[PDB]
Amino acid sequence: LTNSEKSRFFLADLTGEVQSIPNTYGYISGLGLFRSAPQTQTTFLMDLTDWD
Amino acid sequence: LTNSEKSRFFLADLTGEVQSIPNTYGYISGLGLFRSAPQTQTTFLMDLTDWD
């Protein structure tokens, strides 16, 4: 199926491959907590008000 | 879109407003214990009779 290890005139089959995908975590972006608030400016302001 | 800090010529964004309403308790009012007794005069009397 495939040429050998150290000779070009002999054969040795290649039985697939194995992959090692890294570990990616979620469960924080998974929860629908952080709802997006797109804007146009480089900085944004907020108003803080309170009473008693 | 409001005036940025430090400069009256560039702009920033005003996303919103956060409010701090004071805590209010209404357990006794919501219990319905005190039945309403509308009154016409400014004072009301009461008779107290008992025996032994």
Side-chain angles (χ1 to χ4, degrees), chain A residues 1-2 4-34 36-52, chain B:
Chain A
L1 202 140
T2 280
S4 67
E5 292 97 332
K6 289 306 223 11
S7 185
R8 284 191 83 76
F9 307 96
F10 292 85
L11 262 56
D13 37 16
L14 172 83
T15 84
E17 84 177 347
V18 305
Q19 272 143 354
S20 323
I21 309 194
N23 277 337
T24 87
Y25 296 103
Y27 177 68
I28 292 295
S29 41
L31 318 155
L33 313 180
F34 283 101
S36 77
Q39 48 181 267
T40 87
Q41 295 312 312
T42 61
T43 43
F44 64 100
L45 313 193
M46 256 190 31
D47 259 353
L48 263 65
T49 168
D50 63 83
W51 46 280
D52 208 349
Chain B
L1 266 193
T2 194
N3 264 339
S4 62
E5 47 268 81
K6 291 332 275 145
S7 146
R8 308 217 71 213
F9 298 90
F10 305 93
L11 286 177
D13 225 318
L14 192 48
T15 42
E17 187 213 0
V18 84
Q19 291 182 334
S20 305
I21 324 289
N23 304 123
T24 57
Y25 308 91
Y27 177 49
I28 301 305
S29 315
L31 258 188
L33 260 190
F34 287 87
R35 89 143 51 106
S36 172
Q39 181 99 17
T40 51
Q41 298 327 285
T42 50
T43 51
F44 56 95
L45 317 188
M46 224 170 262
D47 275 18
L48 322 172
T49 166
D50 44 12
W51 50 286
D52 219 298

Coordinates of all heavy atoms in Angstrom, one line a residue, chain B:
Chain B
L1 N -23.8 59.0 21.6 CA -22.7 59.8 21.1 C -22.6 61.1 21.9 O -23.4 62.0 21.7 CB -22.9 60.1 19.6 CG -22.3 59.2 18.6 CD1 -22.3 59.8 17.2 CD2 -20.8 58.9 19.0
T2 N -21.6 61.1 22.8 CA -21.4 62.3 23.6 C -20.0 62.7 23.6 O -19.1 62.0 23.1 CB -21.9 62.0 25.1 OG1 -21.9 63.3 25.8 CG2 -20.9 61.1 25.8
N3 N -19.7 63.9 24.1 CA -18.3 64.4 24.2 C -17.4 63.4 24.9 O -17.7 63.0 26.0 CB -18.3 65.8 24.8 CG -18.3 66.9 23.7 OD1 -18.0 66.6 22.6 ND2 -18.7 68.1 24.1
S4 N -16.2 63.2 24.4 CA -15.2 62.3 25.1 C -14.6 63.1 26.2 O -14.7 64.3 26.3 CB -14.2 61.8 24.1 OG -13.5 62.9 23.5
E5 N -13.9 62.4 27.0 CA -13.2 63.0 28.2 C -11.9 63.5 27.7 O -11.5 63.0 26.7 CB -13.0 61.8 29.1 CG -12.4 60.6 28.4 CD -13.4 59.6 27.9 OE1 -14.0 59.9 26.9 OE2 -13.7 58.6 28.6
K6 N -11.4 64.6 28.3 CA -10.2 65.2 27.9 C -10.3 66.1 26.7 O -9.5 67.0 26.5 CB -9.0 64.2 27.7 CG -8.6 63.5 28.9 CD -8.7 64.3 30.2 CE -7.6 65.3 30.4 NZ -8.1 66.5 31.0
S7 N -11.3 65.9 25.8 CA -11.4 66.6 24.6 C -12.8 66.9 24.2 O -13.6 66.0 24.2 CB -11.0 65.9 23.5 OG -11.7 66.2 22.3
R8 N -13.1 68.2 23.8 CA -14.4 68.5 23.4 C -14.7 68.3 21.9 O -15.7 68.7 21.4 CB -14.7 70.0 23.7 CG -14.4 70.4 25.2 CD -15.4 71.4 25.7 NE -16.7 70.8 25.9 CZ -17.9 71.4 25.7 NH1 -17.9 72.7 25.4 NH2 -19.0 70.7 25.9
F9 N -13.7 67.8 21.2 CA -13.8 67.6 19.7 C -13.9 66.2 19.3 O -14.5 65.9 18.2 CB -12.5 68.2 19.1 CG -12.4 69.7 19.3 CD1 -11.7 70.2 20.4 CD2 -13.0 70.6 18.4 CE1 -11.6 71.6 20.6 CE2 -12.9 72.0 18.6 CZ -12.2 72.5 19.7
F10 N -13.4 65.2 20.1 CA -13.7 63.8 19.8 C -14.9 63.3 20.5 O -15.4 64.0 21.4 CB -12.4 63.0 20.1 CG -11.2 63.5 19.4 CD1 -10.3 64.4 20.0 CD2 -10.9 63.1 18.1 CE1 -9.2 64.9 19.4 CE2 -9.7 63.6 17.5 CZ -8.9 64.5 18.1
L11 N -15.3 62.1 20.1 CA -16.6 61.6 20.6 C -16.4 60.2 21.3 O -15.4 59.5 21.0 CB -17.6 61.4 19.5 CG -18.2 62.7 19.0 CD1 -19.2 62.4 17.8 CD2 -19.0 63.4 20.1
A12 N -17.3 59.9 22.2 CA -17.4 58.6 22.8 C -18.8 58.1 22.8 O -19.7 58.8 22.1 CB -16.9 58.7 24.3
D13 N -19.1 57.0 23.4 CA -20.5 56.5 23.4 C -21.0 56.4 24.8 O -20.3 56.3 25.8 CB -20.5 55.0 22.8 CG -21.6 54.8 21.9 OD1 -22.7 55.3 22.2 OD2 -21.4 54.2 20.8
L14 N -22.3 56.6 24.9 CA -23.0 56.5 26.2 C -24.0 55.3 26.1 O -25.1 55.4 25.6 CB -23.8 57.8 26.5 CG -24.4 57.9 27.9 CD1 -23.3 57.6 28.9 CD2 -24.9 59.3 28.1
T15 N -23.5 54.2 26.6 CA -24.2 52.9 26.4 C -25.5 52.9 27.2 O -26.6 52.5 26.6 CB -23.3 51.7 26.9 OG1 -22.7 52.1 28.1 CG2 -22.3 51.4 25.8
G16 N -25.5 53.3 28.5 CA -26.7 53.2 29.2 C -26.7 53.9 30.6 O -26.1 54.9 30.7
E17 N -27.4 53.2 31.6 CA -27.6 53.8 32.9 C -27.9 52.8 33.9 O -28.7 51.9 33.6 CB -28.7 54.8 32.8 CG -29.0 55.7 34.0 CD -30.4 56.0 34.2 OE1 -31.2 55.6 33.4 OE2 -30.8 56.7 35.2
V18 N -27.2 52.8 35.0 CA -27.5 51.9 36.1 C -28.0 52.6 37.3 O -27.7 53.8 37.6 CB -26.2 51.1 36.5 CG1 -25.3 51.9 37.5 CG2 -26.5 49.7 37.1
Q19 N -29.0 52.0 37.9 CA -29.8 52.6 39.0 C -29.7 51.8 40.3 O -29.6 50.5 40.2 CB -31.2 52.8 38.6 CG -31.4 53.9 37.6 CD -32.9 54.1 37.3 OE1 -33.7 53.2 37.4 NE2 -33.2 55.3 36.8
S20 N -29.7 52.4 41.4 CA -29.6 51.8 42.7 C -30.9 52.2 43.5 O -30.8 53.1 44.3 CB -28.3 52.1 43.5 OG -27.2 51.8 42.7
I21 N -32.0 51.5 43.3 CA -33.2 51.7 44.0 C -33.0 51.2 45.5 O -32.5 50.1 45.6 CB -34.4 51.0 43.3 CG1 -34.2 51.1 41.8 CG2 -35.7 51.7 43.8 CD1 -34.4 52.5 41.3
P22 N -33.4 51.9 46.5 CA -33.3 51.4 47.9 C -34.2 50.2 48.1 O -35.2 50.0 47.5 CB -33.7 52.6 48.7 CG -33.7 53.8 47.8 CD -34.0 53.3 46.5
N23 N -33.8 49.4 49.0 CA -34.6 48.2 49.4 C -35.8 48.6 50.2 O -35.8 49.5 51.0 CB -33.8 47.2 50.3 CG -32.5 46.8 49.6 OD1 -31.4 47.0 50.1 ND2 -32.6 46.2 48.4
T24 N -37.0 48.0 49.9 CA -38.2 48.3 50.5 C -38.9 47.0 50.9 O -38.9 46.0 50.2 CB -39.2 49.1 49.7 OG1 -39.4 48.4 48.4 CG2 -38.6 50.5 49.4
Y25 N -39.4 46.9 52.2 CA -40.0 45.7 52.7 C -41.5 45.9 52.9 O -41.9 47.0 53.4 CB -39.4 45.3 54.0 CG -37.9 45.3 54.0 CD1 -37.1 46.4 54.3 CD2 -37.2 44.1 53.6 CE1 -35.7 46.3 54.2 CE2 -35.8 44.0 53.6 CZ -35.1 45.1 53.9 OH -33.7 45.0 53.8
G26 N -42.3 44.9 52.5 CA -43.7 45.0 52.6 C -44.4 43.7 53.1 O -45.6 43.5 52.7
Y27 N -43.7 42.9 53.9 CA -44.3 41.7 54.4 C -45.6 41.8 55.1 O -46.6 41.2 54.8 CB -43.2 40.9 55.2 CG -43.7 39.6 55.7 CD1 -44.4 38.7 54.9 CD2 -43.6 39.3 57.1 CE1 -44.8 37.5 55.4 CE2 -44.0 38.0 57.6 CZ -44.7 37.2 56.7 OH -45.1 36.0 57.2
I28 N -45.6 42.7 56.1 CA -46.8 42.9 57.0 C -47.9 43.5 56.1 O -49.1 43.1 56.3 CB -46.4 43.7 58.2 CG1 -45.3 43.1 59.0 CG2 -47.7 43.9 59.0 CD1 -45.7 41.7 59.5
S29 N -47.6 44.4 55.3 CA -48.6 45.0 54.4 C -49.2 43.9 53.5 O -50.4 43.9 53.2 CB -48.0 46.1 53.6 OG -47.2 47.0 54.4
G30 N -48.3 43.1 52.9 CA -48.8 42.0 52.0 C -49.5 40.9 52.7 O -50.1 40.0 52.0
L31 N -49.3 40.8 54.0 CA -50.0 39.7 54.8 C -51.5 39.8 54.8 O -52.2 38.8 54.9 CB -49.5 39.7 56.2 CG -48.5 38.6 56.6 CD1 -48.2 38.7 58.1 CD2 -48.9 37.3 56.2
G32 N -52.0 41.0 54.6 CA -53.5 41.2 54.6 C -54.1 41.1 56.0 O -55.3 40.9 56.1
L33 N -53.3 41.3 57.0 CA -53.8 41.2 58.4 C -54.7 42.4 58.8 O -55.8 42.1 59.3 CB -52.6 41.1 59.4 CG -52.2 39.7 59.9 CD1 -51.2 39.9 61.0 CD2 -53.4 39.0 60.3
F34 N -54.3 43.6 58.5 CA -55.0 44.8 58.9 C -56.1 45.1 57.9 O -55.8 45.6 56.8 CB -54.1 46.0 59.0 CG -53.2 45.9 60.3 CD1 -52.0 45.2 60.2 CD2 -53.6 46.5 61.5 CE1 -51.2 45.1 61.3 CE2 -52.8 46.4 62.6 CZ -51.6 45.7 62.5
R35 N -57.3 44.7 58.2 CA -58.4 45.0 57.3 C -58.7 46.5 57.3 O -58.6 47.2 58.3 CB -59.7 44.2 57.7 CG -60.6 44.9 58.7 CD -62.1 44.6 58.4 NE -62.3 43.2 58.2 CZ -62.9 42.4 59.1 NH1 -63.4 42.9 60.3 NH2 -63.1 41.1 58.9
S36 N -59.1 47.0 56.1 CA -59.3 48.5 56.0 C -60.6 48.9 56.6 O -61.6 48.2 56.3 CB -59.2 48.9 54.5 OG -59.6 50.2 54.3
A37 N -60.6 49.9 57.4 CA -61.8 50.5 58.0 C -61.9 52.0 57.7 O -61.5 52.8 58.6 CB -61.8 50.2 59.5
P38 N -62.4 52.4 56.6 CA -62.5 53.8 56.3 C -63.4 54.5 57.3 O -64.4 54.0 57.8 CB -63.2 53.8 54.9 CG -63.8 52.5 54.7 CD -62.9 51.5 55.5
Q39 N -63.0 55.7 57.6 CA -63.6 56.5 58.6 C -64.0 57.9 58.1 O -63.4 58.4 57.2 CB -62.7 56.6 59.8 CG -63.2 57.4 61.0 CD -63.7 56.5 62.1 OE1 -63.4 55.3 62.1 NE2 -64.4 57.1 63.0
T40 N -65.1 58.4 58.7 CA -65.5 59.8 58.4 C -65.1 60.8 59.4 O -64.7 61.9 59.0 CB -67.1 59.8 58.3 OG1 -67.6 59.2 59.4 CG2 -67.5 59.0 57.1
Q41 N -65.2 60.6 60.7 CA -64.8 61.5 61.7 C -63.3 61.4 62.0 O -62.6 60.5 61.4 CB -65.6 61.3 62.9 CG -67.1 61.5 62.7 CD -67.4 62.6 61.7 OE1 -67.3 63.8 62.0 NE2 -67.9 62.2 60.5
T42 N -62.8 62.3 62.8 CA -61.4 62.3 63.1 C -61.0 61.3 64.3 O -59.8 61.0 64.5 CB -60.9 63.7 63.5 OG1 -61.8 64.3 64.4 CG2 -60.9 64.5 62.2
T43 N -62.0 60.9 65.1 CA -61.8 60.0 66.2 C -62.9 59.0 66.2 O -64.0 59.3 65.8 CB -61.8 60.7 67.6 OG1 -62.9 61.6 67.7 CG2 -60.5 61.6 67.7
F44 N -62.6 57.8 66.6 CA -63.6 56.7 66.8 C -63.5 56.1 68.2 O -62.4 55.9 68.7 CB -63.3 55.6 65.7 CG -62.0 55.0 65.7 CD1 -61.7 53.8 66.4 CD2 -60.9 55.6 65.0 CE1 -60.5 53.3 66.4 CE2 -59.7 55.0 65.0 CZ -59.4 53.8 65.7
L45 N -64.7 55.8 68.7 CA -64.8 55.3 70.1 C -64.8 53.8 70.0 O -64.6 53.1 69.0 CB -66.1 55.9 70.7 CG -66.3 57.4 70.5 CD1 -67.5 57.8 71.4 CD2 -65.1 58.2 70.9
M46 N -65.1 53.1 71.2 CA -65.2 51.7 71.3 C -65.8 51.3 72.6 O -65.4 52.0 73.6 CB -63.8 51.0 71.1 CG -63.9 49.8 70.2 SD -62.2 49.2 69.8 CE -62.0 49.9 68.1
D47 N -66.6 50.4 72.7 CA -67.2 49.9 73.9 C -66.5 48.6 74.4 O -66.3 47.7 73.6 CB -68.7 49.6 73.7 CG -69.6 50.9 74.0 OD1 -69.0 52.0 73.9 OD2 -70.8 50.8 74.2
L48 N -66.2 48.5 75.7 CA -65.5 47.4 76.2 C -66.4 46.9 77.4 O -66.5 47.5 78.4 CB -64.1 47.7 76.7 CG -63.3 48.7 75.9 CD1 -62.1 49.1 76.6 CD2 -63.0 48.1 74.5
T49 N -67.0 45.7 77.2 CA -67.9 45.1 78.2 C -67.4 43.7 78.5 O -67.0 43.0 77.6 CB -69.3 45.1 77.8 OG1 -70.1 44.2 78.6 CG2 -69.4 44.6 76.4
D50 N -67.4 43.3 79.8 CA -66.9 42.0 80.2 C -67.6 41.6 81.5 O -68.1 42.5 82.3 CB -65.4 42.0 80.4 CG -64.9 43.3 81.1 OD1 -65.7 44.0 81.7 OD2 -63.6 43.5 81.1
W51 N -67.6 40.3 81.8 CA -68.1 39.8 83.1 C -67.1 38.7 83.5 O -66.2 38.3 82.8 CB -69.5 39.3 82.9 CG -69.7 38.4 81.7 CD1 -69.8 38.7 80.4 CD2 -69.9 36.9 81.8 NE1 -70.0 37.6 79.7 CE2 -70.1 36.5 80.5 CE3 -70.0 36.0 82.9 CZ2 -70.3 35.1 80.2 CZ3 -70.2 34.7 82.6 CH2 -70.3 34.3 81.2
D52 N -67.4 38.2 84.8 CA -66.5 37.2 85.4 C -67.4 36.2 86.0 O -68.6 36.4 86.3 CB -65.6 37.8 86.4 CG -64.2 37.2 86.4 OD1 -64.1 36.0 86.6 OD2 -63.2 37.9 86.1

